Amino acid sequence: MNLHEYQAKQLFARYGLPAPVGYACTTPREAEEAASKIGAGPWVVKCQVHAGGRGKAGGVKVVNSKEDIRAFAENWLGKRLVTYQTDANGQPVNQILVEAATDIAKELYLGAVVDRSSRRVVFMASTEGGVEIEKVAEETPHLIHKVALDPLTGPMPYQGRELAFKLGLEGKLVQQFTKIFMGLATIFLERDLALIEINPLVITKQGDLICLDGKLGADGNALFRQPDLREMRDQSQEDPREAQAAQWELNYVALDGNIGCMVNGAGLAMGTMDIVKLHGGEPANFLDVGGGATKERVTEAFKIILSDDKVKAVLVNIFGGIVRCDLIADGIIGAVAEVGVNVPVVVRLEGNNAELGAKKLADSGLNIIAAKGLTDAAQQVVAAVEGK
Amino acid sequence: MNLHEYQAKQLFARYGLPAPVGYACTTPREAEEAASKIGAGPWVVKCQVHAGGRGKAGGVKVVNSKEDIRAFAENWLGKRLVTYQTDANGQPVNQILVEAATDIAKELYLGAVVDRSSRRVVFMASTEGGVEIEKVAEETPHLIHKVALDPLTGPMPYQGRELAFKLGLEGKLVQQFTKIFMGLATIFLERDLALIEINPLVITKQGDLICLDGKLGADGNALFRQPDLREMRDQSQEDPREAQAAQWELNYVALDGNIGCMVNGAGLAMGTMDIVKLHGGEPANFLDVGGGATKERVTEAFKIILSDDKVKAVLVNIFGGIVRCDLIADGIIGAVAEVGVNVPVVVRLEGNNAELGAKKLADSGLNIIAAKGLTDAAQQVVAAVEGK
Amino acid sequence: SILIDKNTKVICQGFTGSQGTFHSEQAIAYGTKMVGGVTPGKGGTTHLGLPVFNTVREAVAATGATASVIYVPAPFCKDSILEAIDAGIKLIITITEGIPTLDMLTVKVKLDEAGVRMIGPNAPGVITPGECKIGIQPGHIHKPGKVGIVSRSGTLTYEAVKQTTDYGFGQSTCVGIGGDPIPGSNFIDILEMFEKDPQTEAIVMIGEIGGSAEEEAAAYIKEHVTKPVVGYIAGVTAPKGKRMGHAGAIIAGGKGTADEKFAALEAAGVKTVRSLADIGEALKTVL
Amino acid sequence: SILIDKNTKVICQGFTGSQGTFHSEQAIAYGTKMVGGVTPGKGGTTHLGLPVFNTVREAVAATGATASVIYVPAPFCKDSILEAIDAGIKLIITITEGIPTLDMLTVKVKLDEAGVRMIGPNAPGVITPGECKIGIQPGHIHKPGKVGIVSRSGTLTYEAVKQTTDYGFGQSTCVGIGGDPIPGSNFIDILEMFEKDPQTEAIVMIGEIGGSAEEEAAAYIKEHVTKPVVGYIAGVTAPKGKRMGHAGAIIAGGKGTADEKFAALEAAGVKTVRSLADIGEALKTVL
Ligand SMILES: CC(C)(COP(=O)(O)OP(=O)(O)OC[C@H]1O[C@@H](n2cnc3c(N)ncnc32)[C@H](O)[C@@H]1OP(=O)(O)O)[C@@H](O)C(=O)NCCC(=O)NCCS
Ligand SMILES: CC(C)(COP(=O)(O)OP(=O)(O)OC[C@H]1O[C@@H](n2cnc3c(N)ncnc32)[C@H](O)[C@@H]1OP(=O)(O)O)[C@@H](O)C(=O)NCCC(=O)NCCS
């Protein structure tokens, strides 16, 4: 689960980490009024969307008149921002972060993730701030420094200094860097973060470390014990169908194609998509039924999948699960009738009563082919969109 | 460093642990006024001294009239309480804890220490509450249950349940016990405790777990990062010479005997005492100079040691250290003159200029024998008290 | 076969819960030597004709179970697993989905130091066809045989199971290591066990996007696996940086794409197959 | 000799501090191959003619030191020790006194898993007379020899050192394991090293009140130590439950009295001596 920059910064504040003076405003009026609360211009106004690359899309500007803050807020509030990290549809700007201008002397990068290969939370620091960290990892690997949090001891100050000295920091900046590391590592552990990215972590002309930006990722699996983060969820930043599917115990992820996929199992889901791909198809989505395929669940699945116009056929691949193949067929039938599915539906069924459920599908009359095996299923759904 | 029961209970409160309703009062008036703040009698009034066995010494009583609370506070405030756990001189009662009477159904024991053998914080629980835990360990070892906190994971709920089920608790009492364990283990780790002892941990007639008593021991070595505990130190509970010695970088511990021992090194100190013992002597104290034996330090040492009338000779055993043997001799000389040491002083010196410092002692005129070796030193100090 | 057999004595944590009950009934019906269960608060009772204990330690003392299947909701798993480890259980199969990554991070460090093996979490379980079944997998599609299967996915494993039964190869043991980012056991751990297992003649390794377990497993296979390995990775068509169902199925930092794993496996000499439908065929080939 | 020798390359953490400076000068004068020091913030400078580094890792890369002596104030020791362990240092001698017990509890768990050996804290150090000196002990009372000494006390060790030099026995190596409750190394750890050391012909084990390291060491000696062991425990006249100077010198729960240790040692066949002045004599006897 992603947080907004303003939220990450509130959090940083809460942990004594340095971030610009700023306020998240929801109206042009609040935004222009925040200028004076901040002080002397110029001020930085930033759209608050979960995606990055807001800069290159004009959502971040340094203005020097209240009249400008206002114009900016007016231009963006309620509008959707499209960055290279959002789909073509962009993310809604409901807050404009208005902060004090910062005097950048140098730009560093400091971030952390759970490294699956070493099974540790790993902090990463680079003098290559302001740049996409992946790019720096690609090209100048020797400029990225890392430390692994020891699960037995918690973050240790020497790790912060290690990074500080490798960044060539010195003097008070080392102590300051260490503080930031210790607190970010503390936040990481205590809020069950999945990711922290400060890009850029800035050394100001006045010679102080400051978090110019902040990107926090929380572990969704830990939200049950993170009430604060739980409330910070901004649903508007994601395709609503995702949260929609989730209440229904479905995992939905919209894609580009026109062949809807409904499968039980994430692995089978991805694999199904790939097979539709292998057979010249174009998967419109990932939808993992995973929770018992009850009739209503399937109905929901269909509503969610078909809520996308590009969908010109739906492949249903169900291997096993809790419900028997005939009950699954009835639900597909019932969902296709009810939801008024106007598209061809190919179904692959494996398990008890696979054939009886196939028969039930064939005898429905509805445009639902019962495939005989997965390869077949694919070819048939692919074929079923040819022309459509 | 020990805390008072009332302090431990404030702490327990702070961590959501259940303890009686009570107030630490410093005057009979506050004490009698606390009765009504508490409610319906009867009330429990307890002298607050670090030692235990306050009960068997009359410092804990269940009274049923304000007039009684008052009489009790009047009898004890400013007076010293002597228990089997204090020296014959007792500990000052400066607070009377006035708490609500508790309806005891059953008495359990729950405590924790750092177990040096297993190198873990270990919680211990027993159904044998109200009893000295050592006694239960002696006699019914199978009734003491233990769990070791895993340093890598922190206290875990299953450990609390383990103990709960071994105590035969059940129903909500298990959840309640687990909470108490989780919090006591959290306090132990976070406040750098050395010891926790809830005796008794009571199951009330109303069927709830409550901390009738509390005995917390903090790790002195951690006080630099425990500001709260730091302020809780009640110096009046210990021989003042101890804190006195500490500011001077001396480790003093009063004993019974009449042969004062001044040595550098805790090991050498104990060993010195034992040798004086082996040679028919009776050590009056443990005093480890340990910090550079400067002249002033030695002077302080003498003041502290001799501040005990029973002292009829002082053995000084110094092996090495930072100051050369002759400078040490001058300081002994200077301290004996200045402090006006009126007792024989035997000195064992080893290291650079051992003999030159021995000469300096012999040529002082002062009653200071320079021993030739440790066994000798002992025999001479022992001999030096014969008759005196 | 690896991990379990006809002699494995299993206890179930969360035994009296829905899934714990339902899936223990299935285990019991298959002949798995379920010998008991743990549900704090119901010790002293019986369920499915087995004793229910309050703690794993009481259950182990009582039954000698060396394996535990965990059906405890996510919020209490760390606690459960840690309790099992502490009670001496040598094998933990954790079915639970949703365990915080930071909990598995700690658990994994513990599992390794205590020398306890854990298959999962977010896994379907383990089954040695004809001998032992721990988990939620459907026992009727398995056939005692010679192919060992390891997968990060439940359903995809079934596809491979179906195929290997339909080619008459059968399965020695199936290990669903789960879809979480920090699993208790990984491909290399299981692969090594198949290599050392006489009964396993070929191996099917099923992966997906995310992490680098597959790439490392490839490197390991080239160097220490001699039996033939057929491999399949799902997620070729998965967007980057989006969780595809399983917590671990997510391409983080543009690293860990299906193609990379395929290629890394191909380079290590593994027989990869692009369509999961051809796992059986590919086995026939190197068999 | 054990732990260190003429070839041990040592770095010093807290090198530019008072004690770090003073005691490194002594080490240097004795011939210990001090090769550098670490003081965050003074990397790139020189002190005592050795390079000063900002981190232990820079110091190890630079010098190949495998040992580190730590003179860092208590509040920063955990950090220091953990930094050394992480930098690959294989031997840590920690002189620092006052380290919170809970810090050493964690450190000790770490030391053991990382396979790093730590002598201390609150210890005088280690010295292999004639070859290497790390610590604060006075080098001039030692004599290269055949007696290995382990003690929880600094000063008491000197007494034993003096005696063994004055009987001409000399010392193979002296290990002051320190006076803290959770030391990095204990009697059994060091004892085992003396048993396996050809140069050490007899052992002097010096203990005191508190804990049960001596009692366990006795049990160990009976079973695995063949060389003769002379033992001495201080604190016969110590009150219970009162800290006698060293953090670990305290009889907690009426357990760990000097007499118990003496008796436990006697039972294991160790030559105990009641007066520390007769350690030399007792050695002569079993020598
Ligand atoms: C594990 C899971 C199945 C549990 O679901 P569930 O059985 O419906 O949950 P229930 O509440 O019915 O049962 C849980 C039981 O755990 C018990 N429990 C809780 N903490 C426990 C602990 N520490 N030890 C033992 N049992 C514990 C409860 O007592 C409860 O049983 P009860 O009803 O007798 O009180 C579910 O949380 C889950 O993770 N599902 C996803 C599984 C999955 O998709 N796996 C992927 C493989 S492809
Ligand atoms: C360890 C001890 C001797 C340090 O005392 P000290 O030298 O007077 O302290 P100083 O402040 O002079 O020096 C400490 C140095 O550590 C450094 N330091 C702090 N944290 C550090 C770290 N993580 N890594 C490396 N060095 C560090 C400081 O830079 C300081 O040196 P500086 O003056 O160049 O800045 C003292 O705290 C102590 O424990 N004394 C008791 C020793 C004892 O009695 N032992 C028993 C054996 S019998």
Alpha carbon distance B291, B254 (integer Å): 19
Q: Retrieve residue A324's tokens.
A: 């028997």
The answer to whether residues C276 and C232 touch, using CB atoms and an 8 Å cutoff, is yes
Residues in chain D: 287
> Active-site residue among B30, B32, B109, B300?
B109
Strand partners, C94: C70
Ligand 1 neighbour C97 (Cβ under 6 A): yes
Q: Retrieve residue D36's tokens.
A: 């550098």
> Active-site residue among A5, A30, A162, A197?
A197
Residues of D marked as binding?
16-19, 42, 95-97, 158
Q: Which of A222, A319, A373 sits opposite C155 (nearest CB)?
A: A319
Q: Is A197 a catalytic site residue? A: yes
Question: Chain A, 317-356: which have a CB under 8 Å from a chain D CB?
Answer: none
According to the annotation, is B83 in a ligand binding site? no
Judge: B225–D100 Cβ closer than 8 Å, yes or no.
yes
B344: amino acid identity, one letter? P
Strand partners, A218: A193
Number of the ligand closest to the Cα of C69:
1
Strand partners, D85: none
Ligand 1 neighbour C87 (Cβ under 6 A): no
Q: Which candidate, D92, D29, D28, places its Cα nearest to that of D60? A: D92
Structure solved using which method?
Answer: X-ray
To test the contact with chain C by mutation, choose from B123, B150, B153, B158 the residue with the greatest count of C C-beta atoms within 10 A, namely B158
Q: What CATH number labels C1-122? A: 3.40.50.720
A261 CA distance to ligand 1 middle (Å): 29
D147 Cβ contact list (under 8 Å, min separation 6): D164, D169, D170, D171, D172, D200, D201, D202, D203, D204, D283
B59 Cβ contact list (under 8 Å, min separation 6): B46, B47, B49, B76, B81, B83, B93
Q: Which candidate, B111, B72, B99, B117, places its Cα nearest to that of B6? A: B99
Alpha carbon distance B237, B86 (integer Å): 10
CA angle D220, D225, D229 (to 5 degrees): 100
How many other CB atoms sit within 10 Å of the CB of residue D259? 11
Q: Which candidate, A63, A62, A69, A59, places its Cα nearest to that of A91? A: A59
Judge: D43–A158 Cβ closer than 8 Å, yes or no.
no
Alpha carbon distance B362, B350 (integer Å): 16
Q: What CATH number labels D123-287? A: 3.40.50.261
Q: In chain D, where are the structural domains located?
A: 1-122, 123-287
Specify the long-range contacts of residues C236-243, CB closer than 8 Å, at least 24 apart.
C236/A274, C236/A277, C236/C262, C236/C274, C237/A255, C237/A270, C237/A273, C237/A274, C237/A277, C237/A283, C238/A270, C238/A273, C238/A286, C238/C209, C239/A253, C239/A255, C242/A253, C243/A220, C243/A253
Cα radius of gyration rounded to whole Å, chain D: 18
Q: Retrieve residue D212's tokens.
A: 């049960």
Calculate the CA D122 to chain-centre distance.
Answer: 9
Alpha carbon distance A109, A144 (integer Å): 9
Alpha carbon distance B171, B176 (integer Å): 9
Q: Retrieve residue D147's tokens.
A: 């007696």
Report residues whose beta carbon is within 6 angstroms of any ligand 2 atom. Answer: D 13-14, 16-20, 38-40, 71-74, 76, 79-80, 95-98, 122-124, 136, 154
CA angle D64, D69, D75 (to 5 degrees): 125
Phi and psi at residue B52, to the nearest 5°: -105, -175
Judge: B271–D246 Cβ closer than 8 Å, yes or no.
no
Q: Residue D54: list chain A partners with CB under 8 A.
A: 161, 165
Q: Residue D57: list chain A partners with CB under 8 A.
A: 162
C251 CA distance to ligand 1 middle (Å): 29
Alpha carbon distance A212, A103 (integer Å): 10
Phi and psi at residue B365, to the nearest 5°: 100, -40
Q: Is B128 a catalytic site residue? A: no
| Residue-wise DSSP of C192-223 | HHHHT-TT--EEEEEEESSSSHHHHHHHHHHH
How many other CB atoms sit within 10 Å of the CB of residue A61? 18
D21 CA distance to ligand 2 middle (Å): 10
Judge: C253–A152 Cβ closer than 8 Å, yes or no.
no
Strand partners, B245: none
Interface residue A135 vs chain C (CB under 8 A): no
Number of the ligand closest to the Cα of D82:
2
| Residue-wise DSSP of C174-188 | EEE--SSSS-SS-HH
Judge: D152–B267 Cβ closer than 8 Å, yes or no.
yes
Q: Which candidate, C10, C14, C13, places its Cα nearest to that of C30? A: C10
Q: Retrieve residue A236's tokens.
A: 């508007």
Alpha carbon distance A54, A92 (integer Å): 12
C78 CA distance to ligand 1 middle (Å): 13
Question: Strands across the sheet with B43-47, in order?
Answer: B22-25, B96-100, B43-47, B60-63
Q: Which CATH superfamily does the domain covering B240-388 fall into?
A: Succinyl-CoA synthetase domains (3.40.50.261)
CATH for B21-104 (3.40.50.2000, 3.40.50.720, 3.30.1490.20, 3.40.190.10)? 3.30.1490.20
> Quick one: which atom of ligand 1 is closest to the CA of C77?
23
The answer to whether residues C40 and C55 touch, using CB atoms and an 8 Å cutoff, is yes
| Residue-wise DSSP of A338-365 | HTT--S-EEEEEESTTHHHHHHHHHTT-
A102: amino acid identity, one letter? T
Beta strand pairing call for A313-319 and A259-263: parallel
Indicate the resolution in Å: 2.5
Q: Which residue has the tokens 């490798």?
A: A166
Q: Retrieve residue B197's tokens.
A: 């002892």
The answer to whether residues D114 and D169 touch, using CB atoms and an 8 Å cutoff, is no
Q: Which candidate, D66, D7, B322, D46, places its Cα nearest to that of D15? A: D46
- Closest residue in chain B to residue A151, using alpha carbons only: B152
Strand partners, B217: B2, B195
Q: Which of C40, C41, C109 sits opposite B152 (nearest CB)?
A: C109
Q: Which candidate, A355, A376, A134, A203, places its Cα nearest to that of A275? A: A376
Q: Which candidate, C123, C46, C48, C54, places its Cα nearest to that of C83? A: C54
Beta strand pairing call for A193-204 and A120-126: unpaired
Q: In chain A, where are the structural domains located?
A: 1-20+105-239, 21-104, 240-388
Strand partners, A379: none
For B348, the 3-state DSSP assignment is strand
CA atoms in the 13 A half-sphere facing the CB of D122: 25
Q: Which of A152, A156, A170 sits opposite D79 (nearest CB)?
A: A156
How many other CB atoms sit within 10 Å of the CB of residue C157? 29
Q: Is the peptide bond prior to B42 cis by the omega test (within 30 degrees of 0)? A: yes
Of C18, C56, C93, C208, the residue with max ligand 1 atoms within 8 A of its CB, to mutate for a pocket test, comes to: C18
To test the contact with chain B by mutation, choose from D102, D127, D205 the residue with the greatest count of B C-beta atoms within 10 A, namely D102
List the subunits that have 3+ CB pairs under 8 angstroms with D: A, B
C18 CA distance to ligand 1 middle (Å): 7
Ligand 1 neighbour C95 (Cβ under 6 A): yes
SS3 assignment for B183-250: HHHHHHHHCCEEEEEEEEEEEECCCCEEECCCEEEECHHHHHHCHHHHHHCCHHHCCHHHHHHHHCCC
Q: Which architecture does CATH list for A1-20+105-239?
A: 2-Layer Sandwich (3.30)
Q: Whose CA is nearest to atom 33 of ligand 2?
A: D17
Q: Which candidate, D227, D232, D218, D228, places its Cα nearest to that of D273? A: D232
The answer to whether residues A304 and A280 touch, using CB atoms and an 8 Å cutoff, is no
